[PDB]
Design a protein around this ligand. Structure first.
Ligand SMILES: *[C@@H]1O[C@H](CO)[C@@H](O)[C@H](O)[C@H]1NC(C)=O
Ligand SMILES: *[C@@H]1O[C@H](CO)[C@@H](O)[C@H](O)[C@H]1NC(C)=O
Ligand SMILES: *[C@@H]1O[C@H](CO)[C@@H](O)[C@H](O)[C@H]1NC(C)=O
Lengths: 171, 53, 108, 171, 171
């Protein structure tokens, strides 16, 4: 995509994360593991579900239509009937394939932005209390226990609270 | 052949039991049918790019 | 202590096309195109078709002697005709406005 | 949108700003108020106006077309005439609705980026002379009078000029 | 575009760069010049080439189709034949023009992001060993010879190696 998160700053996805699309991984003295960001994932799902259903639901049902018999002196009309069917088939095939390709590209950019935005949310929370490393990770300069990890994920990190410790650990 | 079955869409090659917007089975149909296209596949992505690491 | 941001991955082989790339493996996908059928002639919402067997529409509607099995067939959902009916106008002649009659009977 | 400004870093819009779409709000010892960014707003308007007019102007006028009478022995032709009209109606309805939905989504991303870019323009001007706070605001570390506020808005902020004052105020 | 690189942070392009689309310019004691980023350029090319070819390749060949003669008592059929041709022409003209306009806009955003992402790649490599200046340039705080310039371009810059020198040069 155009935001550069998927197989970009993030080396690749997590096969160990099973409760969502976007999320976090953590490690501290009390344990480690993966957890999904339910708010980000559900919003991504609702957007995509509406997009898929829009493409399908806006299409009308194909109503009964069959070919027509023509006699041997009605070739001009038979050829007109065929022209109409071929023209409609060509229009719908071109549009169906091109629409899907255009929308698949946009879906992947949608996802690329959503994970990048999650990354920035944390960067803005942590400020100088952690450093950026590759693979989309923030390495803390202070002890961050399980209560801290939940606080960072929820967007409630009390930045100044940990600033004295990080200033010392940063040397 | 005719058999003891029911469908909302019937083509000359056999009945269709589906809710998708398009079909590539046959242009001539009776009933409430998916629209006929010449496409081999119309697959849309809903998930993420599947690149683990 | 570390917090990392990433995204989901799995064992999926579902592959989609995009305008910039031609073979993209994705974790989840939806098929918008139906390519199967059951090979059978079915009832439509409970109503059976009229099977003309070896009879053409002309054979049926005129009473061709070999189309006797189609006499009691008072109602139907659609009409099914074999590709090359053999029992039609048994006494040869021109059937006026035949194609037009077929178009109108098909709605009955 | 995918840039995250609208009801994102910006809590919501300003009902007190009436001279444009994008803009600034300020407060200092000489006063406070709202003012639009006329360059950003006018470019956004021109882009959108061209988009709307393109959708309308590229459409041809519907020229006289009426149904046709057929007699009782012309049902096959009547049905062909109808098939042509229904097919064209189905194509244009599907395309008209889907086009509008796709373009409305893009318009909202257009706007989301334009306000985010305005935010970044200021961040790049102020550097270390102000801090980022929530709601898309920069809190200055030096006195910034009305001449300063105009300078920041115009992209002419003389950064080093205020650096000694901000270094002291930053502690 | 919506990323703001083209005639944005970058004042304009380089007529002196001839081996690609995206790239670098450098100056140090051993020389100066332009060089393209071959990985970025080739990926941009492949994406665009696939897009152009998709628009063309998904179109079917126009197969022989000519008008039809009608006699003087077949005006209703002549008018139906014409209606079919005009309807198909109107659909394809509208779609062809609108598709090209929509895709040209997306191509320019594609390029705007690709150069911006290249800019960020370097910013992340250099960290505190260089400062951002206008026109998309990084001014180094340490001597950066030709081996250094290749290292930065390749994404292999050994940041801490130059940190003592830059701390002193930064005052
Ligand atoms: C993925 O693994 C699960 C078992 O954990 C299995 O049921 C599923 O079929 C596998 N999917 C694919 C695409 O191989
Ligand atoms: C994409 O995959 C299909 C098999 O599903 C293969 O036939 C085709 O050549 C592949 N193509 C490209 C253009 O990368
Ligand atoms: C229809 O044709 C087949 C093949 O010649 C024959 O076996 C069958 O008896 C014919 N039909 C009827 C309805 O009697």
């Amino acid at each position: 995509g155009l935001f550069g998160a998927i197989a970009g700053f993030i080396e690749g996805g997590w096969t160990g994360m099973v409760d969502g699309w976007y999320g976090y991984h953590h490690q501290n003295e009390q344990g480690s593991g993966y957890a999904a960001d339910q708010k980000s994932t559900q919003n991504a799902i609702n957007g995509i579900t509406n997009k898929v259903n829009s493409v399908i639901e806006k299409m009308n049902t194909q109503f009964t239509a069959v070919g027509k018999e023509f006699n041997k002196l009605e070739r001009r009309m038979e050829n007109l009937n065929k022209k109409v069917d071929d023209g409609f088939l060509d229009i719908w095939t071109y549009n169906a394939e091109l629409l899907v390709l255009l929308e698949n590209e946009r879906t992947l950019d949608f996802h690329d932005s959503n994970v990048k935005n999650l990354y920035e949310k944390v960067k803005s929370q942590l400020k100088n209390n952690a450093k950026e490393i590759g693979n989309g990770c923030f390495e803390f300069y202070h002890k961050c226990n399980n209560e801290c990890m939940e606080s960072v994920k929820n967007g409630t990190y009390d930045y100044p609270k940990y600033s004295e410790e990080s200033k010392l650990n940063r040397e | 052949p005719m058999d003891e079955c029911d469908a909302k869409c019937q083509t000359p090659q056999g009945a269709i039991n589906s809710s998708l917007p398009f079909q590539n089975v046959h242009p001539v149909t009776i009933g409430e049918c998916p629209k006929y296209v010449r496409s081999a596949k119309l697959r849309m992505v809903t998930g993420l790019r599947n690149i683990p690491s | 202590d570390t917090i990392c941001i990433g995204y989901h991955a799995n064992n999926s082989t579902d592959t989609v096309d995009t305008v910039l790339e031609k073979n993209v493996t994705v974790t989840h996908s939806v098929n918008l195109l139906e390519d199967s059928h059951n090979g059978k002639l079915c009832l439509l919402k409970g109503i059976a078709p009229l099977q003309l067997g070896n009879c053409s529409v002309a054979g049926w509607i005129l009473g061709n002697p070999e189309c006797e099995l189609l006499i009691s067939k008072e109602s139907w959902s659609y009409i099914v005709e074999t590709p090359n009916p053999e029992n039609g106008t048994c006494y040869p002649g021109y059937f006026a406005d035949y194609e037009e009659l077929r178009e109108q009977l098909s709605s009955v």
